[PDB]
Amino acid sequence: TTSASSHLNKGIKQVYMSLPQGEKVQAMYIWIDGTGEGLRCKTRTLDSEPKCVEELPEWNFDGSSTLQSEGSNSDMYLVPAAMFRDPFRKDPNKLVLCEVFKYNRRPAETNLRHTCKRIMDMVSNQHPWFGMEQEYTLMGTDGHPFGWPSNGFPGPQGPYYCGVGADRAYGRDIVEAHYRACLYAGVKIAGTNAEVMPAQWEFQIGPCEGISMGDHLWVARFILHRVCEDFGVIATFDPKPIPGNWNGAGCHTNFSTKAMREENGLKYIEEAIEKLSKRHQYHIRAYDPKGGLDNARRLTGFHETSNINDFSAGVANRSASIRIPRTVGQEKKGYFEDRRPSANCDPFSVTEALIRTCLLNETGDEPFQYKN
Amino acid sequence: TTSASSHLNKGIKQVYMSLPQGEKVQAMYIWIDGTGEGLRCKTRTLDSEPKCVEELPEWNFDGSSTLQSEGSNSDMYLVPAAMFRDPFRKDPNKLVLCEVFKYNRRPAETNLRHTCKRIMDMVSNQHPWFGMEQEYTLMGTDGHPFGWPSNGFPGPQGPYYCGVGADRAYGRDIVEAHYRACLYAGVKIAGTNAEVMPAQWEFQIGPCEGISMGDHLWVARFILHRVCEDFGVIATFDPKPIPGNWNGAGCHTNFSTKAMREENGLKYIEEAIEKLSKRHQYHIRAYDPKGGLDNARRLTGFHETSNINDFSAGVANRSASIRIPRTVGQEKKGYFEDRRPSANCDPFSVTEALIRTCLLNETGDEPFQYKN
Amino acid sequence: TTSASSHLNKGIKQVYMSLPQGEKVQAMYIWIDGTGEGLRCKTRTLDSEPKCVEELPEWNFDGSSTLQSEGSNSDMYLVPAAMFRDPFRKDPNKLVLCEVFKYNRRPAETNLRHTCKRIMDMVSNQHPWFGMEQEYTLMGTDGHPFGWPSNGFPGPQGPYYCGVGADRAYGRDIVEAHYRACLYAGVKIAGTNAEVMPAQWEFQIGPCEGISMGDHLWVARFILHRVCEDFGVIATFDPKPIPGNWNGAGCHTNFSTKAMREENGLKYIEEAIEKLSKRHQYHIRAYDPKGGLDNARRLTGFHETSNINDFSAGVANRSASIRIPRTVGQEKKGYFEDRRPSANCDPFSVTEALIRTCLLNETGDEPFQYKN
Amino acid sequence: TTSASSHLNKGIKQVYMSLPQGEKVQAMYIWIDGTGEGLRCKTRTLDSEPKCVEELPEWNFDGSSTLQSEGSNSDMYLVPAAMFRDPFRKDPNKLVLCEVFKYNRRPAETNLRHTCKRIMDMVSNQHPWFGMEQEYTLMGTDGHPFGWPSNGFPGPQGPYYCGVGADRAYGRDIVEAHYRACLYAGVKIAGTNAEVMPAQWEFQIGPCEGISMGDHLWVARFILHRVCEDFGVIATFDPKPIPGNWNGAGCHTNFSTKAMREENGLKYIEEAIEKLSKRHQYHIRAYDPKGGLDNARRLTGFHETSNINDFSAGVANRSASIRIPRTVGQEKKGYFEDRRPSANCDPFSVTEALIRTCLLNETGDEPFQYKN
Amino acid sequence: TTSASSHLNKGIKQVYMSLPQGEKVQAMYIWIDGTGEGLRCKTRTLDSEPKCVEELPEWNFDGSSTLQSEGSNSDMYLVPAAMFRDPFRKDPNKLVLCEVFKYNRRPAETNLRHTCKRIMDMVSNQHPWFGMEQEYTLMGTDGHPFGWPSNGFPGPQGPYYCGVGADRAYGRDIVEAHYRACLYAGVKIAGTNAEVMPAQWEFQIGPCEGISMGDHLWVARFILHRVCEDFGVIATFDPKPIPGNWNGAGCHTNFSTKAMREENGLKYIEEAIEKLSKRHQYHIRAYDPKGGLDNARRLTGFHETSNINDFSAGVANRSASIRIPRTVGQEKKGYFEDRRPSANCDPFSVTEALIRTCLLNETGDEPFQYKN
Ligand SMILES: Nc1ncnc2c1ncn2[C@@H]1O[C@H](COP(=O)(O)OP(=O)(O)OP(=O)(O)O)[C@@H](O)[C@H]1O
Ligand SMILES: Nc1ncnc2c1ncn2[C@@H]1O[C@H](COP(=O)(O)OP(=O)(O)OP(=O)(O)O)[C@@H](O)[C@H]1O
Ligand SMILES: Nc1ncnc2c1ncn2[C@@H]1O[C@H](COP(=O)(O)OP(=O)(O)OP(=O)(O)O)[C@@H](O)[C@H]1O
Ligand SMILES: Nc1ncnc2c1ncn2[C@@H]1O[C@H](COP(=O)(O)OP(=O)(O)OP(=O)(O)O)[C@@H](O)[C@H]1O
Ligand SMILES: Nc1ncnc2c1ncn2[C@@H]1O[C@H](COP(=O)(O)OP(=O)(O)OP(=O)(O)O)[C@@H](O)[C@H]1O
Ligand SMILES: NC(=O)CC[C@H](N)C(=O)O
Ligand SMILES: [Mg+2]
Ligand SMILES: [Mg+2]
Numbered sequence A, B, C, D, E: 001t002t003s004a005s006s007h008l009n010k011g012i013k014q015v016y017m018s019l020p021q022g023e024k025v026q027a028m029y030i031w032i033d034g035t036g037e038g039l040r041c042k043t044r045t046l047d048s049e050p051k052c053v054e055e056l057p058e059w060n061f062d063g064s065s066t067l068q069s070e071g072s073n074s075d076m077y078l079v080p081a082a083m084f085r086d087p088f089r090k091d092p093n094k095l096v097l098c099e100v101f102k103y104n105r106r107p108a109e110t111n112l113r114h115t116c117k118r119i120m121d122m123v124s125n126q127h128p129w130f131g132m133e134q135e136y137t138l139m140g141t142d143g144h145p146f147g148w149p150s151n152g153f154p155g156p157q158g159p160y161y162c163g164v165g166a167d168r169a170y171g172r173d174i175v176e177a178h179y180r181a182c183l184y185a186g187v188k189i190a191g192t193n194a195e196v197m198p199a200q201w202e203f204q205i206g207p208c209e210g211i212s213m214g215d216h217l218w219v220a221r222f223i224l225h226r227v228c229e230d231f232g233v234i235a236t237f238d239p240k241p242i243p244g245n246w247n248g249a250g251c252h253t254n255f256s257t258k259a260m261r262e263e264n265g266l267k268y269i270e271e272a273i274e275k276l277s278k279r280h281q282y283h284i285r286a287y288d289p290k291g292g293l294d295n296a297r298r299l300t301g302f303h304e305t306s307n308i309n310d311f312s313a314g315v316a317n318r319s320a321s322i323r324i325p326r327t328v329g330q331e332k333k334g335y336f337e338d339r340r341p342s343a344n345c346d347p348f349s350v351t352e353a354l355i356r357t358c359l360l361n362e363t364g365d366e367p368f369q370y371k372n
């Protein structure tokens, strides 16, 4: 149920990692492959510790092995975008998140941060904030949820939500390690909780401003994968990991602006929600790397989920597509939550779509090519 | 499966290694055996920590047990050549790389450093630089790749290159330990990445000047073997560990001179590449410890490899024998990469051949005795 | 394969060993039993740390349980002879090597240090030096070499001598722990190496002066047994642990005097060798605890060994009974090596026999009763 | 990977089964559940061995437990249709295949034999003959193909088709037992062969005339499931059990009547095919129990398969929708093969659709509701 | 080490196989695939037991899945050639060996029986007799010889040849079962013996006359594969399964005509030997399915064999290319043995080459056309 790599003597590894490093510094470059969901990484040595992301040199990789280029001119370029402390190697080593460009310096097909960044710069003075709740399931190497009975099922749902105990919470060690690792690296992690299905969990990122939301979520996803690799388990973001009467996995998004956060900001919240009601199909396509196919298995109108093809909004309503928190409604200010995006969504796509519809008043089935 | 030695209680060993050492210092002598691929080692005690390699005493070993000498005159001599810090015993213990000489003080058959050093001193003013990318595969004690299904195969290639996750990268603990050990010892390690084959990895050494490149690669190979011994796995440099549609293993070499690195040095790069195009058969024989038989199983013109019988060169071409990086071509200066050498090549043999053809303008099938 | 005691939780033991000791000091007494090969030990508490071996009190043990005494008068006496730091309990605890005397204060049958010490004092002005190479094999609790295939054999010899790798060296953890323990205790250990047969190793002790050589070897043997006990394996000194085409185990002895070590000392080396050629049968009996029967299984004239019936000497000859190193012959000074003694020899017997023949010019088959 | 029931001592059961039955006769009733592809069985005791199916008494069962009815009129009825000798209990025990009728004596939703029997009685003068090649995959209790590596894949396809050997044929014990059982029971089984991917097999039923063909295939499916129960494995009829470069499963149907079986009947084959070319979509709907949502994963136009959206025909063309054997073309008489129906097809639906289009000259989208 | 199919309850299968067959008869069709080394099989049902092979109808198969045809004309044909009793299903079921023809009724590339049958019909009066000693090695599913220690080797050779005992003969159950099955089926099997290395055996077929030799050997190979499938082991015909000091596998051929079988026929043997002397390279090419790339690893001139590039002959000389039995020389009448062909040789190729060189006096490196 666990990988063979996880059965190696981990005490041996800790002895080697206790050696003083010296002067040289390791940097790990991370980018998104051609599937729109996978992550890749590799390491290089630097002569001295960088102080800002702009001191890091550019790099390259063979795009033919990642299904991002074919034939000749298969080389692609990595341009650093964000820098974080490395929790797996400690200071002064760093983690670098990069953008992907093809050989003629054009952005890659899966490079969505390029367009999103320019959109955020246009509405900078309004200070948009984002908060995302990421759900996932821990799986064994055999393709079944971690800790589940062999070729069987655990008891019915109800005691696993925010549960405590050996028979109610599976794999809390991964969650605790991931929480501590994110804090060390500088990722703005807000909290965690156990989900309805056993071995299902969730963590929250935010509130983050502008383009920083997409960077923080992707790095948090990488840390989860790397941490799970140490324990020998697999973390999946599939919207419906288990068929039948079991909870799905989504990525709820919280959105707010400076006007929304001020006194009597509830008026602006309702205007934004009204605009969102006119572009249901546009956002469904944007909330999924496959165009909406993955989210169809989850948004069936059951298990506290909204219908895929219907739009609804309400205060303190967890069955609608858009939910206004009861506290926000009473104080006439705050934020609102979008419950449509799936667990495997791209944060750069989700954040950009919200800004276009609500702040730029875009209309139609296609984004505007130039500004606005 | 792993070795029985790896199942011993490693916590017991750490208790003994925590004892203060005292005044005596341990030195490990390392040399190359008669096969041209294997490494041998043994330890002696010194009264005080040596400051330079010049003050290490000479030693000897029985050559009849290593297939390097006859019966009557079996003694061979070890002459220290380089010193490094010992990462397995910590300071002040040392690792010593030595040359092998026969009983009549003549160089051994596999002692290729003696001739390479003299060639290096001939062009010392031009400051040649070398960079080598060494690939390898992690193997279980049962003769099958580590982490692979028993009597089976993993999924098709494509998600393993620079992959992250329990189902995408096998044996990262060895790689992490090896990287830290090389940094502590003083080996000029440049970076690592996961390869197309699962359980296949690669590390880069350089840029190194002259004879230092050969010394640094051999010590890096020794550290990999010693580290893998702790975990109970086997590291192989075989060019084609597994037959079929699986990636091979090579040792790419990057070469540059002082003239090449300066402005408009691309003209010198073209001159060297032109010279290399005339001595294809000479370099193929030199790029393999068996005269080229091993590299025949890998260089078949498939899986981003060049043909064994044909010579080709190009800029940003990963299917040719010689590749010019696109960045180098744009800046009109830099280096070029030779993709012919196999994974089990001798670095002393490879570096010497490049200098002879490109800098000493040698012509023919035999090296020139004395001078160039 | 490994003992049941080795499967206990070793982390539990370290917690207890971390408790501060206090004022009392533990002392472990070690002696040789009636078989002439076995070692025994027990511990007592002392009120304060002793500074010299002469401060240690005498002790006693029941000789009927060690096959050394009669029925009615079973008590034997332990007289401390040498003191060392305890590597298993750390400072200020000590290890004590003792001599055995009968109830009437006469030396025991296996007590050979008593006569050897008096012989040593007779030639103290010549400063004899000794160096011994102890070979041994690591065995599992099932009676087979450690790491060997169950009911099978590994590959043919040749890659195991001074080998590195998971498939070439078995049980290096024991060797590393033993090396550090000897250094901490103060035993003059000179170096180690892997032997021809897999799971066979060797360590060197010396150069030691006079009676101190026998004390250091016996304590080194005790530390090896105690270290192997922690890992759950057995170390055997049997001359021929495995029948067939597998390497034997011996104890080569290096001998020199202050005259041999000075300039033109090679002349003195030859004279000693000629004297040794006259008493071949006398030394064969003295080199084995059983009278020569054990060494008969090893010294068969093959596997770089000399024949048990014939005496031969030569320079740089590993097939002769006496070997002169090539370096010694060139510099006309140094030492010579005796390759006859078996791996289970008593160092006190071996050192005494060399002095009697070479320095006291003794002749005949019996030692001289009083002095020389 | 195998069921716990299969680990019981089968020798004990054989002792009981050898007891003389006496005079009573056991009868097993078999019917199709509400899913349209599952089977249910029940056993009753008869006073004497029946000589024909016409004298077997009717029975009943609870439709609520079988999801063929709600909680008000859950009771259903079973009417015997065919009788066969029992291979699992031997003579004189028998197997009975029955039709399902509602409480109001109307055929159930999944009872397709009622309408099919009426249709083929109309064209009984032409004597239509049918032959279907049924494919299936053997799977363990863990949901993985039987004999496959744990969490892995076997070698690439090519040696498994009609293979022999421990590494080429998986689970030949089941197919041999099923073949012998079908012959004993009286099912018109024609032959078996191993398929392209390992653990996949195929058997052929026919040439069966009239409504008997639908009866024979359903009984053959029941015997396969019952036989696999003894060995503890699961037989599945999914069209695409394993995604990727692995062969799918289908049910090729061979059709002919007296016209094509006579001389120069090749023209009768041609006119029937050209009629089938018009109603491509209609037959696709009726060839799948789910309307075509299952066969879409198999008919992808690769691995020697025809595209689901394209109709084609040809002589000895295995990539077309309809295949005419080369022998049939050269002999100008015989039959034609339909490669469209999936493995989990209903035999009654498949035979009925072929009769309507090719013999009754029907057209449109809905079947012709009345008799004439 | 054994297949998962072999762990199924074989008692269950025996219960089903004991059911009376009835009246139908099963026939198994066997043919050689495109590799020229493997075999393929499938089963059909017959309405009655055929008295002779001439009553068996023709059949067909998909050549694309067998690697014998492309996708355009993948269909191939099977023509029965010989019939044998089925030992795995008992009477009246049959095994049939069939020839393979293309769609245009031409022999396939691997169909060497067609031309072989024509050649042997031209020397019918001489009545050539053949006897081949076929050697093979039993292997586990992990690629290691059956019964060998895991990741290890057994003792040195010498006791395993024709040995008896649990430690000397590995897998005699397969040998005994195969011997009994061959006798039941009608294969002219002459005897068996254990070979030099463990888990290696040999059986002898003959003396068969004419084309009968090729049919019997191929059927015997099929029975061996089928029998080994029941036990879960793999039979290998590789000439050198294990490199090193382990014996190889070959197929010695014994040849004689009526002239050599008459009085003073030793001279006729001698004329045949000298005719075989000047066509050594031609026969070596035809004695291997790959032209000699396999037999080169066995005929190294060691382990009592002959060199690949040298021709030799002699009486009772087992190290020569051709051996004449001492008893044959003593009686001046008999046969001669060819020790050149490898274990994986094609009997049709071997018999044809011997006939056309010794009895038809062919010369050159190419076989004669219709002229011979
Ligand atoms: N003003 C704000 N603007 C944007 N995001 C905000 C704001 N205030 C809080 N958030 C974010 O909203 C998220 C709240 O997630 P939380 O898990 O508490 O939701 P919840 O209401 O319990 O919903 P659910 O039932 O979906 O889990 C956090 O990520 C937080 O950072
Ligand atoms: N001027 C130089 N001269 C010589 N070697 C250099 C020089 N600059 C860099 N190198 C070396 O070249 C190597 C760069 O190879 P690296 O593996 O990073 O990339 P790559 O060749 O594109 O990758 P791959 O061939 O594995 O796809 C490093 O070992 C580096 O030290
Ligand atoms: N002058 C000396 N007098 C006595 N002993 C000495 C002297 N110099 C060195 N020695 C000892 O001789 C031994 C050297 O043996 P070592 O195992 O290093 O080499 P070796 O005899 O060539 O090895 P092997 O026989 O295993 O091939 C050491 O124990 C060392 O202490
Ligand atoms: N005249 C006929 N009318 C109807 N069915 C027939 C007739 N003759 C034979 N059949 C049936 O056709 C089927 C032939 O199946 P078989 O496996 O031999 O086909 P195939 O041509 O090799 O196809 P495939 O390669 O798709 O498996 C059998 O079920 C057989 O009973
Ligand atoms: N007159 C004959 N003509 C042809 N073949 C014959 C004749 N007599 C015997 N044979 C065949 O020769 C073969 C003899 O093989 P056998 O293994 O007994 O011989 P061998 O010389 O002892 O073998 P090996 O080379 O293994 O030592 C048998 O297959 C037998 O049928
Ligand atoms: N150990 C010695 O050399 C002398 C010891 C001395 N008797 C003491 O006071 O301990
Ligand atoms: Mg939440
Ligand atoms: Mg929420």
Ligand SMILES: [Mg+2]
Pocket: B133, B202, B204
């Ligand atoms: Mg590289």
Ligand SMILES: [Mg+2]
Pocket: B133, B252, B337
């Ligand atoms: Mg490279």
Ligand SMILES: [Mg+2]
Pocket: C133
């Ligand atoms: Mg030594």
Ligand SMILES: [Mg+2]
Pocket: C133, C252, C337
């Ligand atoms: Mg020695």
Ligand SMILES: [Mg+2]
Pocket: D133, D202
């Ligand atoms: Mg078929």
Ligand SMILES: [Mg+2]
Pocket: D133, D252, D337
């Ligand atoms: Mg078919």
Ligand SMILES: [Mg+2]
Pocket: E133, E202
């Ligand atoms: Mg024989």
Ligand SMILES: [Mg+2]
Pocket: E133, E252, E337
């Ligand atoms: Mg023979």
